[PDB]
Amino acid sequence: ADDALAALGAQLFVDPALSRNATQSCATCHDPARAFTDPREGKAGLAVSVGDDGQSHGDRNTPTLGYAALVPAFHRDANGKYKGGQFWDGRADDLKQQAGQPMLNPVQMAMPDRAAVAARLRDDPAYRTGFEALFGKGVLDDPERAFDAAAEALAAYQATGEFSPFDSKYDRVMRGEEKFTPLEEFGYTVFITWNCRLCHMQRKQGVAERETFTNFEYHNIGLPVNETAREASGLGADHVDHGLLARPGIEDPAQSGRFKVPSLRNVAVTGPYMHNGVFTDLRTAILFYNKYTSRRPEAKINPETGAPWGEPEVARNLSLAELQSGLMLDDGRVDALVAFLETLTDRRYEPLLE
Amino acid sequence: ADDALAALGAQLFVDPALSRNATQSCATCHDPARAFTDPREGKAGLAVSVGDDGQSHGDRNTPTLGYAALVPAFHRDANGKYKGGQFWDGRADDLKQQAGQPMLNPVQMAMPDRAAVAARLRDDPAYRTGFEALFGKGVLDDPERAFDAAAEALAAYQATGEFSPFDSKYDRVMRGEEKFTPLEEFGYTVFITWNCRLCHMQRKQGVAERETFTNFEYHNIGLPVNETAREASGLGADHVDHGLLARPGIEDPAQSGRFKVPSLRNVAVTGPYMHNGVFTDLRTAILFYNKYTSRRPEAKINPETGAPWGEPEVARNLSLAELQSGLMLDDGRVDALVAFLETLTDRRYEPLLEE
Amino acid sequence: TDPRAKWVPQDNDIQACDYWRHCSIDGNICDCSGGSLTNCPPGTKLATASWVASCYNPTDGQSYLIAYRDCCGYNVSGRCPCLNTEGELPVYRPEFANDIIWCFGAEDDAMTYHCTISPIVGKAS
Amino acid sequence: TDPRAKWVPQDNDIQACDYWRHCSIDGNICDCSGGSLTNCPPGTKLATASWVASCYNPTDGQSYLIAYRDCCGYNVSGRCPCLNTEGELPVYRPEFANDIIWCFGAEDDAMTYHCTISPIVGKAS
Amino acid sequence: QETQGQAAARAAAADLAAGQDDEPRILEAPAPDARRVYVNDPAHFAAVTQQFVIDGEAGRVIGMIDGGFLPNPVVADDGSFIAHASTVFSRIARGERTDYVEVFDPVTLLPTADIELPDAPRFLVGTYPWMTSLTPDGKTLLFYQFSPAPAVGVVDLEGKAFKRMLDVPDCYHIFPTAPDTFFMHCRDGSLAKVAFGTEGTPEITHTEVFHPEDEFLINHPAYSQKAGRLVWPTYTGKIHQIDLSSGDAKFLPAVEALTEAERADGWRPGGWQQVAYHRALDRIYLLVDQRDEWRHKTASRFVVVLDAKTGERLAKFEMGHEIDSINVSQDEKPLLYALSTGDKTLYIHDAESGEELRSVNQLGHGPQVITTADMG
Amino acid sequence: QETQGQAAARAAAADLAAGQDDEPRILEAPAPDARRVYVNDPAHFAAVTQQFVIDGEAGRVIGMIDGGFLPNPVVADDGSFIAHASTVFSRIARGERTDYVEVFDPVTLLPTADIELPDAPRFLVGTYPWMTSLTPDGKTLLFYQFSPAPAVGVVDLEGKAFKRMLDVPDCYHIFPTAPDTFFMHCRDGSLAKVAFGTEGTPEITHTEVFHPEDEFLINHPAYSQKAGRLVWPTYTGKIHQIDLSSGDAKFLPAVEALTEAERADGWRPGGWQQVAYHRALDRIYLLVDQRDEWRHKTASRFVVVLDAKTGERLAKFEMGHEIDSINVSQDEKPLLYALSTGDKTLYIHDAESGEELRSVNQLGHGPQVITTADMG
């Protein structure tokens, strides 16, 4: 039932017939062997992915699809903070509304319209069988129902066990099945007592049943532009990524520069980091947070470049209250956080840690 | 000796024969009818006194001799405070050392020298008898002996109960013979809780056996020059009264402008006030002290002239720690203090109090 | 009221020093000066730093991470003083130390100590 | 120890609140923080102002005027606190009133209350 | 019978079990109401002090406010703000002095104004409510100065600025009656009426003398600004009442809080805020006990309640604690507040029956001053 | 038998009877000597605090010093001066923070220096004596900073100015060995030696790790700058000793303050200043009692005394009170000082026999820290 729906989405997910020149599927960018991220090396490294046309690059890093099913539907909470949705800017309400948009994006899979999708669906006898079995006879002859049905299947597929297994070492230690190493427990202790936990934990307090190390909120942490990616995207170096403000119907200027807090599950194997893939290394991602806390000279310097981080792409609505913790992470604490974050790697990707 | 020496000094005290032109005795300037002060009007009112020559004025107001025998001889206490002595600048050690000085001072009794004084004494047969009975035969033939004996008799006379009777209303009240009016009582309460007691009580603490309302120290309270007195004295518009620093032997610049704290006994009948007689009214002497504590415009103004108190004659070493009390005397408290200081009047001068 | 005896947690009154969540609290319970178990009183400023402890809850038999956070920018409350030290380590392990004034991150750079709150932020281990 | 009982002066211990000179003291006895019965402790500043009282001395049957003077510029000592009010009148008779901080004329404009001294200034009338 | 600490344990436990989230944050205090009561702790003259904001009905601390040396607290009757005049120094109790007024929001307790008073002009005294006072419209704060002489400082809370010092005669306390008028009690046994402006010598008018030099009027009279009623006990429990509602003083008949036989057996008032007045009831409450005549600042264990019109005694309550200060809420069925300096505890009594209902302990080091708003 | 207050009454009665005058004045404290003792009251984290200066021989307060929030007191071993680092705020506990160092004359108690520390650098923590520290020459004061990271501030007392912060690694406490060198204790188990010229990075060198992760070293060890003995107990009562007198660290035999049986039956150190070291006698003193393992900060009713060379116990005293902190005079026939936070009282014992000689009560709100000068 829901089994079949997701089984259908499992087909669609790896089908390049949903791209105009048939060179790419969802799995091309969201590679299951790489925690549903893109292994391929484009003009700006792994910072941004290349579409079906062989040339177009996006302006944002491809995110994991692991655990994305745990994110609530986009909404504004009672404190007036936006929460949930999909894409780094939350412009899609949920997984269903998101699934169609890579198909039609010209810089990605680049199908011309819903009709071209339906046409490609109808060419496969297995889709005619699978689809008509769940949604009724002729559904592939209507472009709108067909596209919507494919979006449903993909969303159901993304909500299976397989994308959210909770089999990380962190999960096993919380069930009492093993223990953290000393370094890992120090990192976890540091994670829940430093500012990380104000953003990368589901709840403010209490214990979560299915923790994904994000509160689903939107924050501007003051990241610089990623120069080579921005160049490859061809969006122009006058372009500004306004983050959530780009979601249609968000108007409040206080949301400019803010992005969805990523889940930190699998973070150790889904480099490069941040919405624009600016940092290749995890430890650099951690060290970026010291720029708001540390006195030292080296805190201004991106160790990957040997040069200053760079000014924020959007120099307002910085989450200063959370970021100006008054405390700097020394090497031993950065070490320990790396170890803890490594324990959020799902079982099947533990081999990737090297 | 005791009664007889005092009685000899009683005769000298009133004897004009100790002045050059013989117009003038101790009693001329220290009038027993006016608490041993000078009632005579001169070129500067009652501020300074006119000498034997009829013309010369002093630069300092003639003080009472009442209670002066209670002051210790001049000394430096271990705090480094000079204490005691006689004259407003303490330049005499004690009564005996002071007594001969108005005899030889040209602006006062103006006798040319000790032999001249001796000559005057020799001419009175009562002195030949009284002096020789106490100090031996031929005393009056040796000018240094005669002058010194006369000083001694005079000091003795000022030490009698006549000079220090302790019979003021305050004394009667302290013995439990009467009581203060509520006003006087309030005045006493004020005097002993405000800054007055820091200088106008014998002791820093405890109880004095014969209170005279002075600690006998030297303080510069920042008084201006009394211009009419200073003009009469003839010492010059450029002259500075240095107070204690004028005592020979005192060289310390911090003593400049300091004057001996007077006894407040009989103060109500010994106007005008301060070492240069600058204030006429007791009230004004009290209000002077508000210049250091009150924020009001009127506190800068001498109510007798309508004009500012005036620049201190000596603008350094002021007793600011004591004077800057942080509390102003309102009119009710000034009244009360006037009431209280009036109770310090000896019985015999009570009749003087109406005027 | 035997000070040296093993601390016995209870889950029936949050104002007393033996309430289970206060197992490594140092100072004053904010519930006693106008806050609540997990909220600061008016006019104070909520720090972002915390020392942590694993506190045994007698009720469900589970151990929870209490991340103590201070409310800063007022003088000490003087009500409901407590000092407990379950699992508390010396200053050179600051994450577990409680002599330290954890007012870091507080608004307006508030660093004076008024009282402490006792929120659960996790399960032990 | 009956606080409402008529106060009973003694002349055998200056640190006790029933010492005879403390009959209208309000504050702390300077002897207990490094002063003496009539001197201020180091680092403080001696006021020139006072309030007064007539206190019976049971050693000799005389009543003396005690001009209380404060030592100022330090926080309240917290040792030997006492409050007596023999003859003490309300604020509008300030010479007899002891809730007022009598720190006026202290060096350096010191107006904080530290402790009080108890010197004699006269016999009672 | 379930305590507030127990109720909160029970609710946190339900939340933990229901998996209920909630964000740690800064609480707002509840809206000011008639049963809010403020307790100030002058801490036996310490350089810094505290005020506790308490819900009388629940007997719960709902807030605090820090202060300096012997501050003077005021509370707007309408409940729109609270304020104090306070005093700090650059090195704890030494160095440069700064006197200042803060106004605070009554629910966030944040300072909405901080107004410097030039030249350290506050009266430093054990705390008397009516040495700092709000005008009835809440726009002006008036504070007494003693040194170098009695004066009254005018602070404009609306423009947030110090205006001026007023010279006054030899008088004490400040009882405002109008936006530009207040009364003072004078050494001469009169009241003075003071009508002031932004400049100019103020219009100062004395009443008749209303008591002898040897009846002693206590430092803590009750004044109900809304009723214009000034209730002024003497050391013997004799009570003066002055009616200022017309804007001029009118002297009401004196009443005796204690009977002749009580007085012959040593009954006298004693404490700190030894009197309270309830405006809607027109009732007076007086702390009294058996005591020597010069033990007038000691605690008392009894309150007498009398009708203000007739002087008829309505009740004599045995408080059962050492009580230094009292006051009442101004609502119907008022509470009677009984604060023990010694116990550092506010005991909250039903004012009709005298019965102790609840209490709030741990209120600083020497709490002395109870303040309530008359919001009716 | 005769108390100080009684002897005082006899003297004052004789002066009165004999008519002896004397001038009310500010006293000087007596010459600092070996029996002088300092007691700091952190006041359970109050915004203002007090230090009492005590003549331990007479058991008499001879002076007091005011401080701000969690000050760090130091005392020059030669008796030449005392100092603290302190912290104030423009509005009691809120507003602009000023951290500063004051130096005082040790007989007038007047500040001789007030040196502002830039950027609020002080570590605010319940008071640890070796978080702020004088160099042996007394020309330099060194204070610990924890935020944003471990660092050490260098304050020039001779020039009366702040110099600079030193970057250090993840280490804690400051034990100065020369004008330009101090040791810290590091998270990794080593000591760090920090040598600083006037400029550049300090030269920093670690010892080996000298204790394990599972072995907990207390916040209040004892350090004798004159002997260079660092005496560091752990939670179980085991005692580390490090000699620093050669300018480099050399670890003396570890030693145990309690017997294997006593541990077995509940004996553990506990309190605040749990340890004292007497230099001349080479003798360690350790507050201990029967307690659970996570009650390490509670009071202890016993002291044990043992030889620092050997380990042998020399005595065990029942102190007869709840004791939080101990120290000793550094002269011959020393006093053992036993401070109770709860009683606010300094109990003063003969250190040879443990007998209580005298005591000093009313030492603030929560007194915790005892400092003595080593003058011989």
Ligand code: HEC
């Ligand atoms: C050409 C590369 C590419 C392909 C093909 C592609 N994606 Fe994506 N995917 C991205 C990028 C880039 C983003 C983030 C873009 C943004 O934030 O605007 C993304 C975001 C998402 C997200 C939101 C995740 C989050 O945490 O916000 C979901 C869900 C997703 N993709 C699912 C799919 C599905 C289903 C397909 C097949 C229909 C697909 N993707 C095809 C590159 C691709």
Ligand code: HEC
């Ligand atoms: C103000 C809330 C906030 C705090 C505090 C915060 N983060 Fe983040 N974190 C984010 C947001 C938002 C992003 C995504 C930012 C972007 O790409 O624009 C992020 C991204 C990351 C990433 C990269 C994840 C990815 O998939 O690209 C890592 C790793 C990370 N954070 C770790 C931490 C650690 C460790 C701490 C504690 C030092 C921390 N963060 C504190 C909000 C926060």
Ligand code: HEC
């Ligand atoms: C011309 C008036 C005049 C005459 C005559 C005079 N004096 Fe004086 N007397 C003064 C003045 C003026 C002072 C203050 C002078 C000064 O301080 O320099 C004074 C001061 C004194 C003092 C010091 C008192 C004090 O409080 O300082 C004594 C004693 C004294 N006179 C005694 C005598 C005796 C005895 C005689 C006769 C031998 C005498 N006087 C003659 C005017 C006079």
Ligand code: HEC
């Ligand atoms: C600093 C110590 C000091 C204090 C305090 C002080 N006085 Fe004086 N008083 C003096 C001195 C000195 C003189 C003499 C001044 C001069 O003539 O140079 C004096 C003179 C007087 C005189 C005039 C006496 C005469 O015979 O000429 C009166 C009256 C007087 N004081 C009253 C008071 C009153 C009342 C107070 C309290 C308001 C007071 N004083 C406070 C030192 C003090």
Ligand SMILES: [Ca+2]
């Ligand atoms: Ca990535």
Ligand SMILES: [Ca+2]
């Ligand atoms: Ca005269």
Ligand code: NA
């Ligand atoms: Na790049």
Ligand code: NA
């Ligand atoms: Na938008």
Ligand code: NA
């Ligand atoms: Na003249």
Ligand code: NA
């Ligand atoms: Na000279």
